[PDB]
Design a protein around this ligand. Structure first.
Ligand SMILES: [Mg+2]
Ligand SMILES: [Mg+2]
Lengths: 402, 402
């Protein structure tokens, strides 16, 4: 059999989503997510103008060969745009293979290792009081894990605050919004949030915090130690990690669990963080890090050091990615947790899927393939609309890490 | 002053080139290269649909701030497409600053450290005999350094062979050409090429060889040792380097100089190769690794360990890049060598530049800015044409590294 077409579909049912649909001369087709928040059209071009033309005529059953073809063949390796394109192709090909096998994707990966998939929700407030209230709401709904983010007095638009209740939509403008930041103000406030959360709700629930690249290694170590009494599930992306040695000082000084990786796109971005045992959870995703084919390798390397998966799951990852992520989560032995930000009703309608949520857990269905599809007619009713992620600047104007 | 427009210009005067032109309300403008061979339109979209809109209204004098804005602001960091876009912006802004300062770019970087810029040419042949003849031609022309690449009996289309005499144009087709490879055949043949070159021309000339990612670390060590008697200037890209530990075995076993980096896009791709002293020449370029702003940092880190610059200089790097590269080469203290593949007459006409070639050396002119400009009217006469880099497969069909 052969690939007859590899079409890119763009839609904005609440926010932008890019999808690749690989069609065959056999009839069966597969789809994959290619969404890169804030730079969506670069992937559209990468696929439409370069990768797709090469796929025509190839044998879609050869997932590994095609992955290697697009990865090595690009010559210029790795990268956000590059790997999003490769991930889209990979997801679509596994979708096709699962459909042809007549089994839901997780069965092809090795079968079910668990029943439900534990997730964490997103509690945010303008201050500690409001954030505490927010966590209680998730506890009431039956969530086992909750991420808590609070605004900080004196800081403009702290990460994860004021852009949704059951979700967080950062890309809020036609041009990047500028947010503020001050480390000292945050170091003096954040620990108090978790102190209050434990005083109010006890220690039964898993509590998470996203440091969102704001701290230096020493500052992350400082914050990590200050958070130890509160037993967090994890302190995420505490410091920029292009330099994988960045987590060394943090790991040496605190026992607060560490997580990182949502912005990683290849195993090469995390091999040292994993092998040097600097993290507890790897956050790489199916769409961000080259599909099931590559994410499997990242998860396996992590398993050697008891590092677990903690897949990123914000709204900018389409339901196609969540479907693939849940099949992955259902099988992977070293599963840790799955981030779950709820999509809009319009998004769910455009991307019919076989996965549901109940009492703090996500469940993948038994539909052959990854269980997700795209209603092209409905998708066409929501035109693309430019939306950027914010940028952060220190009080003196210094460009920082949002 | 403010940026009034950031336009992307596409042209194909012999091959594809993408250029960014930043215009200001002051009148002065600057241009930068954004060409990514084989994936050109992905960068066009990255710039046109995402980055350019953000640049409007910004102060072009703030080179560092804008670099940080586009680098950190993208959120998804690093990458071939990402850094090509950033490099284009950076080159254009330095072009503007140099013009405003009324000085050729090298003066702003710290002034002249040398007169001419030593380059190396590209000698290739279907076999050793023809390649030897080719090296002699470059020696006759006054070249001080020559890269020698030979076809290998039993191997289909060895790297750098059969696609030009004074240059090598890999992107030779509407779809990726498939070349063959066999390591044992090459290991048994390549050393003989250099043995013959030294027997024929002696040891006065610098001789280079591009391993082009074909070998494993152990095989590169083997080849490196076999090449020692011939005193090569360098053995380049001997083994894939996404894993920076890949050069360890090679460095431990041979004293043949090593070079790597044409496909790198950030200092993060080379920090360990440099700090662990695994290479002698870093090949990163102004267009591949984020402009003058970032390449300067890469060169400086290299200098700490006496590693020198050996900028990649194939035809897919436009004259805009060569102009910036020569200003960089003229100033940088740890300059090693500059690769020089000649552009077509049409390309030189579309990109008027003040640099020239003479008896083995390139020279940058004194024109304010980086000395290069683009004739938009002429550029419009050469429409974009899809062209891909080849892929390599082993004899059994295994996707390999071209
Ligand atoms: Mg995060
Ligand atoms: Mg090379």
């Amino acid at each position: 059999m052969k690939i007859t077409a590899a079409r890119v579909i763009i839609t904005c049912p609440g926010r932008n989503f890019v999808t690749l649909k690989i069609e065959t001369d056999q009839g069966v087709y597969g789809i994959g997510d290619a969404t890169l928040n804030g730079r969506e059209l670069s992937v559209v071009a990468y696929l439409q103008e370069h990768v797709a033309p090469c796929l025509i005529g190839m044998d879609p059953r050869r997932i590994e060969d095609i992955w290697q073809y697009v990865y090595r063949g690009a010559y210029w390796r790795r990268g956000p745009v590059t790997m999003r394109a490769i991930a889209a192709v990979d997801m679509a090909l596994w979708d096709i293979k699962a459909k042809m096998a007549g089994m839901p994707l997780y069965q092809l990966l090795g079968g079910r290792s668990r029943d439900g998939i534990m997730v964490y929700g997103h509690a945010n407030g303008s201050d500690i009081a409001e954030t505490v209230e927010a966590v209680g709401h998730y506890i009431d709904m039956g969530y086992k894990a909750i991420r808590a983010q609070t605004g900080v007095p004196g800081i403009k638009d702290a990460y994860g605050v004021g852009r949704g209740k059951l979700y967080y939509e950062p890309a809020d403008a036609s041009l990047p919004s500028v947010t503020g930041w001050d480390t000292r103000k945050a170091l003096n406030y954040v620990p108090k949030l978790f102190e209050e959360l434990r005083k109010t709700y006890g220690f039964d629930h898993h509590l998470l915090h996203d440091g969102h690249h704001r701290y230096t290694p020493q500052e992350a170590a400082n914050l990590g130690k200050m958070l130890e009494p509160y037993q967090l599930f994890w302190l995420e992306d505490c410091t920029p990690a292009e330099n994988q040695e960045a987590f060394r000082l943090v790991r040496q000084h605190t026992v607060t669990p560490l997580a990182v990786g949502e912005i990683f796109n290849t195993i090469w971005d995390a091999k040292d963080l994993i092998q040097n045992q600097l993290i507890d959870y790897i956050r790489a995703t199916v769409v961000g890090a080259g599909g099931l084919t590559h994410l499997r390798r990242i998860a396996d390397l992590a398993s050697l050091y008891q590092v677990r998966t903690g897949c990123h799951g914000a709204t900018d990852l389409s339901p196609v990615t969540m479907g693939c992520a849940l099949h992955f989560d259902t099988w992977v032995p070293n599963f840790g947790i799955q981030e779950y930000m709820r999509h809009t009703e319009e998004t769910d309608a455009v991307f019919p899927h076989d996965y549901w949520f109940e009492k703090g857990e996500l469940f993948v269905g038994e539909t052959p393939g990854h269980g997700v599809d795209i209603d092209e007619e409905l998708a066409a009713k929501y035109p693309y609309k430019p939306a950027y992620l914010p940028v952060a600047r220190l009080e003196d104007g210094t460009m920082w890490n949002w």
